[PDB]
């Protein structure tokens, strides 16, 4: 198992700190993103590409990834695939 | 045991962070959902399909899932 | 050991998050239930059936079960 | 080792969440009970019988048991 | 190792929750006792006997024991002696 | 596995306290840096060189490293 | 490894609860002691003898010991 | 692995409580030192010798060491 997960373009997240990884489509997750953007808890790791996963950490940080949600989770074991 | 659980579509939840997984059929759980919506703690992972399970995590996040609660808990092992 | 306990009708609780499971038979736990209801911390998982166990979690959530307390704790295995 | 201890009549307490288990025979503990009662943090698991143990958990819940402290702690196994 | 320690007359304390066990003689510990007595965090487990150890737990509870401090600690392994 | 990671020039970070390590190339991260600077929570470990990684720890400390994120995470071993 | 450490006389400290053990020879540590005294977080286990070590635990308790810091840390193993 | 690290002159820190060990060479860490001094969170363990490492603990304590950061982390073993 990987302690740090690559969420795209070299950016890393500690697996032990993730609560949930989800699609950005719905309105509750978009409110969460905007609240984080406003409280300075948002991390944008998409490197300009399109957001495909929103990672919520236990410290109310919100991390935007260009990698799809389950691919992020799969990377806990080293590949995009499980 | 999996540490991340697919709760429907590609949405993942860390199993260690779950307090309870329940059906949304009662007034108290509905109050919990509305409260989480209003405070920016709701996560909706149903992709529009009907809510079958409500997952309460430990940071007071509430996650709506389209999968039955018992099916969510079995995915801990596969 | 089961990490999630079935508390009736497919509703699940994480065993590690339980503080106490008790009968709903006393004034203090009923004050705990009504407080949870007013504060939006109550979870009713009885599926319309008697409350036979009150589960208090470490987040001040209060979960009503149709299964009796010792039965809940025995389903840990 | 049990994760859940039967504190009498099928009422369960999580052993890891217990701070101390004491007899209810002193003024400081009785104030702890009264405070818990007023704050909605008291749980009464004595099923109508005399209190022989007061269990303090880490969430400042206070749980009354009809079983003496030593017997509560011995049921960990 | 004992998970619950007998601090005298059947009263039990969880070993994992103790921060410190100390003699009651000095003025800083007596202030701690009186503050706990006033905030309802004091537990008197001496069963009327003389206080010989003050146990401080991680939740700011203060527990008075009739057993001497190192005897309390020794009881982590089952006897008054190590 | 190392408990402490060298983030450059002999500066050490505890691997278990890291939440995320990211590049400093986006507006949201730069605000995180500026907030940390104003709050006395910023640590600058770049020894005078360009920032290539921003490490967020669980105590909301923010630590600037002259080493890219992937290289920081790879030094766990 | 011991989980309880004799810090002098019969006074015990849980090793897992210690943040740091230092000599009291500097102004900052003295401020920490006075602050703990005033807030009811000081524990004095020196039995009057001179303070050789200051033990900062994780609930902001400060414990004065009559034993040298390094001697306190070796008693973790004996 | 050593549970306590000697940071110079017998002063000890618990390795599990360290967030980061860094050189005192930048404006942000000096703001962290002075804030700790004003708030009563500073611990000076240099024994009157140069500060060569600043150790930030998870309780917002700040510990000044005469030993260089990488040396502190190497004494973990």
Author numbering:
A (entry chain A), E (entry chain A): 2 to 83
B (entry chain D), G (entry chain D): 2 to 79
C (entry chain C), D (entry chain B), F (entry chain B), H (entry chain C): 2 to 78
Publication excerpt:
The transcription of these genes is activated by regulatory protein RemA, which binds to poorly conserved, repetitive DNA regions but lacks obvious DNA-binding motifs or domains. Here, we present the structure of the RemA homologue from Geobacillus thermodenitrificans, showing a unique octameric ring with the potential to form a 16-meric superstructure. These results, together with further biochemical and in vivo characterization of B. subtilis RemA, suggests that the protein can wrap DNA around its ring-like structure through a LytTR-related domain.
The structure of (Gt)RemA was determined at 2.3 Å resolution by selenium single-wavelength anomalous diffraction (Se-SAD), because no appropriate search model could be identified. Amino acids 2–83 of (Gt)RemA could be unambiguously assigned into the electron density map. Analysis of the crystallographic asymmetric unit showed that four RemA monomers arranged into a tetramer reminiscent of a semicircle. Thus, our structural analysis, consistent with our biochemical analysis, shows that 8 monomers of RemA form a donut-shaped 8-mer with outer dimensions of approximately 71 and 35 Å and a central hole of approximately 20 Å in diameter. Closer inspection of our RemA structure with the aim to identify its putative DNA-binding motif(s) or domain(s) revealed an extended, positively charged surface on the outside of the 8-mer. Moreover, this surface coordinates three sulfate ions (i.e., S1 to S3) originating from the crystallization buffer. Two (RemA)8 rings are always stacked ‘back-to-back’ to form 16-mers.
